[PDB]
Amino acid sequence: QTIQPGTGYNNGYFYSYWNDGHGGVTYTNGPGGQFSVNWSNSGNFVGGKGWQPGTKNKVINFSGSYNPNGNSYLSVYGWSRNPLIEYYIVENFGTYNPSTGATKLGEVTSDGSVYDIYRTQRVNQPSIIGTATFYQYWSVRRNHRSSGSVNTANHFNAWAQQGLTLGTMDYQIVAVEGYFSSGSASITVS
Ligand SMILES: NC(=[NH2+])NCCC[C@H](N)C(=O)O
Ligand code: NA
Ligand code: NA
Ligand code: NA
Ligand code: NA
Numbered sequence: 226q227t228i229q230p231g232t233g234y235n236n237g238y239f240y241s242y243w244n245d246g247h248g249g250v251t252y253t254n255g256p257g258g259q260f261s262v263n264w265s266n267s268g269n270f271v272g273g274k275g276w277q278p279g280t281k282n283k284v285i286n287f288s289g290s291y292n293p294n295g296n297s298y299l300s301v302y303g304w305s306r307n308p309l310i311e312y313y314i315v316e317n318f319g320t321y322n323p324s325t326g327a328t329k330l331g332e333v334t335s336d337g338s339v340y341d342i343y344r345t346q347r348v349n350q351p352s353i354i355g356t357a358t359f360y361q362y363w364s365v366r367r368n369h370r371s372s373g374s375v376n377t378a379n380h381f382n383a384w385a386q387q388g389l390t391l392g393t394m395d396y397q398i399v400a401v402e403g404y405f406s407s408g409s410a411s412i413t414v415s
């Protein structure tokens with residue numbers, strides 16, 4: 226169903242839906258690993274489905290329709306603790322590449338494309354443990370897509386060769402993120 230922000234479990238999968246308090250987002254859980262998000266003039270939000278906790282060797286399957294009109298991402302997205310990390314394997318994005326301004330550290334080839342690798346830092350921002358300073362790890366796919374599989378270990382291995390180490394996994398989902406934009410998406414995870 227359509228829900229307010231929160232986390233939980235639906236039809237065998239973990240879900241997380243977060244927003245910054247602005248209006249405009251409709252997040253709906255569906256059967257199985259399905260979710261839908263429609264946004265009209267949102268602020269910042271993140272929603273999707275997957276697992277609590279994730280693993281360092283999961284092969285994640287996704288498919289569906291992704292139609293951003295402005296700044297948005299479609300990603301494998303999750304967190305670790307000790308160290309506290311927010312990470313992204315970005316499969317598609319709208320008008321804004323999330324790595325803009327960031328220092329490139331390397332490349333990895335996985336699941337039919339090269340990805341470029343970046344680290345960023347978030348200072349005194351929201352996190353899974355409350356306000357915190359933490360690093361973000363990014364793999365950004367050069368060839369955008371709306372369905373496929375992601376061998377997460379290929380990314381996690383490549384990040385570790387640049388000192389981008391992960392802690393104990395927290396959640397791991399396929400997420401749609403938007404930032405002061407509009408769009409529509411409907412995705413099935415497995
Ligand atoms: N990329 C983002 N917008 N991240 C939002 C993180 C939200 C954070 N985990 C919280 O529960 O407050
Ligand atoms: Na974007
Ligand atoms: Na995303
Ligand atoms: Na991949
Ligand atoms: Na995770």
Ligand code: NA
Nearest residue numbers: 271302400402
């Ligand atoms: Na996200």
